[PDB]
Design a protein around this ligand. Structure first.
Ligand SMILES: *C/C=C1/C(=C/c2[nH]c(/C=C3[NH+]=C(/C=C4\NC(=O)C(C=C)=C4C)C(C)=C\3CCC(=O)O)c(CCC(=O)O)c2C)NC(=O)[C@H]1C
Ligand SMILES: *C/C=C1/C(=C/c2[nH]c(/C=C3[NH+]=C(/C=C4\NC(=O)C(C=C)=C4C)C(C)=C\3CCC(=O)O)c(CCC(=O)O)c2C)NC(=O)[C@H]1C
Lengths: 315, 315
């Protein structure tokens, strides 16, 4: 049952410390991670309303010029499809995805979702079949018990991602946590069996993670890129970014990651009967962008795992 | 607890009638559906041991010339990967998949699996993201009860496939079945709520379907193409084809499909606690080849559904 948040810093909210961190408004940082670009658009007219400041790097056109243009003009091939895929009032975790062409090598990956009357569009460069998830299910299904399932799950996720460390972190009723399974690079010190206080993942983080099942920090040293304008014109209120993987990570968590010597981090919620049961928590020693298709796979695996857990705890 | 099978027809087995059909050796027809090609190879040397008679249509080289050649020479880029993916003694439902180039438009899709010391390779022409499965999970999860889940499942599968009819067929303890949910093209007569005798899916079919979760008939009027030679040289016994979607369908079932006015059929097992709970059973009015990537998606959905069923029946 999380505290209400304070205003974001850009609305004159207070600085975040270890005394008030459960009130950080992490879903509305007004900025993104610099390895992709983000636009927002009117969900009906398709008019481009906000743009990350770096958008020219990715889209090949100056942020000041793209604004106010409609998606029907900017994405003539994707706009109808995107409209149909994300109707008014659809779930905010529902996504449309397309891979577009661009002047730089490979493609751009486009991910879109809807919050209220706003569409949120994420672009990231890209260079995974249903088969990888399909093949994985077998060992997860054969695991004789919960601990075995967790061991299979982390090993499988490590094999699919290449991440230096993959943990299954399970929450206790006091919201403390414990590393119950771990697959890691040889010689990396074990976190297996270690317990952490509830404060390491504060209540508003756990609440968010029950709604939007995947979040990441691709470079624990990269500075965020502002959304311009920062508020949504539709509303003159902050833009909700919990549904965007590009969302800027809490600086408090960035520092936490750096203190651990973590270069890149990613986790997937394990949600059992609508409650946050735990996290598949992943680390890389250096910055790393997991491709969109792989993240999507990991999301589905998180759901598969949730159900298998729920099956075994009911045994 | 199925009867032992008779020899296949090509070993002088008897003709199959309505009196002896539970003894049809459906897993070893010695032939494939003509919309793809099949080779078998030695699991260690990679030597090509059997070939469907149509293989030149697909592979661009005469069946008599490809035989005895090794996969290390025929597929130099895929052979190492395929070896690594399918080690000796791996599950027979485990698959390797690659998309190859060929002189005819689009690509060839390659699917491989291992049975004992034999590798079975399937080639089919091809022109689906993890996103489709990912997006579907939401409505399946929100369904308040079992009947609602089944209704969501058939509608989702219909939307993903375009099939004229998608049913959820649930088995009773006497092995009779019932159509408990159905999504169908407007004006197609309903099978919803109809019951069928156990004999419609005989015991050796149900046994197979517990092991290999997807099978299909792409053209209920297409004649099968022999494997040449018909027996596996490794063993001078029939080649097990239950793990191959190209496997020729039982002629008894082909006639059953034609009597229903079905042009194309496909089903996915729903397996709950190791038992065959039921089938997502799909029909098209005309012949239709569901792409490999879509079949794989449907397989994963079958597993997702199995777990959700198992969750709700334990409620
Ligand atoms: C005063 C508040 C602080 C708090 C902030 C905070 N932490 C997160 C998110 C995460 N914290 C995690 C902690 C774990 N990672 C580990 O490796 C281990 C143990 C080995 C633990 C206990 C994790 C996994 C997350 C999820 C995100 C991720 O996987 O990287 C947030 C939310 C960040 C965001 O989503 O923007 C916040 C605000 N952490 C505290 O230590 C105090 C200082
Ligand atoms: C004397 C034996 C016969 C028997 C043979 C048989 N049937 C199958 C496989 C299937 N039969 C199915 C029947 C249903 N499809 C439906 O649409 C309905 C009701 C609307 C029913 C009851 C189904 C679904 C299958 C699975 C395959 C598929 O989805 O197409 C086999 C095995 C075929 C194979 O895998 O090679 C066999 C040997 N059917 C009988 O009627 C008697 C005549």
């Amino acid at each position: 049952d999380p505290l209400p948040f304070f205003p974001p810093l850009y609305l004159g909210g207070p600085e975040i410390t270890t005394e008030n961190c459960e009130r950080e408004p992490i879903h509305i940082p007004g900025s993104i991670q610099p390895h992709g670009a983000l636009l927002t658009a009117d969900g009906h007219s398709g008019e481009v309303l906000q743009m990350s400041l770096n958008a020219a790097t990715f889209l090949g056109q100056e942020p000041t010029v793209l604004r106010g243009q409609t998606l029907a003009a900017l994405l003539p091939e994707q706009w109808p499809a995107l409209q149909a895929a994300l109707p008014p009032g659809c779930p905010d975790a529902l996504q449309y995805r397309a891979t577009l062409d661009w002047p730089a090598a490979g493609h751009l990956s486009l991910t879109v979702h809807r919050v209220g009357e706003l569409l949120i569009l994420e672009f990231e460069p890209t260079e995974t079949g249903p088969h990888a998830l399909r093949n994985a299910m077998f060992a997860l299904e054969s695991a004789p018990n919960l601990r075995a399932l967790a061991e299979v799950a982390t090993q499988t996720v490590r094999e699919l991602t290449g991440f230096d460390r993959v943990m299954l972190y399970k929450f206790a009723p006091d919201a403390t946590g414990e590393v119950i399974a771990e697959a890691r690079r040889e010689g990396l010190h074990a976190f297996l069996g270690h317990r952490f206080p509830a404060s390491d993942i504060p209540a508003q983080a756990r609440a968010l993670y029950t709604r939007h099942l995947l979040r990441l920090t691709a470079d624990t040293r990269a500075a965020a890129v502002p959304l311009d304008p920062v508020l949504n014109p539709q509303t003159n209120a902050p833009t909700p970014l919990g549904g965007a993987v590009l969302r800027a990570t809490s600086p408090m968590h960035m520092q936490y990651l750096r203190n651990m010597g973590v270069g890149s981090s990613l986790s997937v919620s394990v949600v059992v009967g609508g409650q946050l049961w735990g996290l598949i928590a992943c680390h890389h020693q250096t910055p790393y962008v997991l491709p969109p298709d792989l993240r999507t796979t990991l999301e589905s695996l998180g759901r598969l795992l949730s159900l298998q857990v729920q099956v075994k705890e009911a045994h």
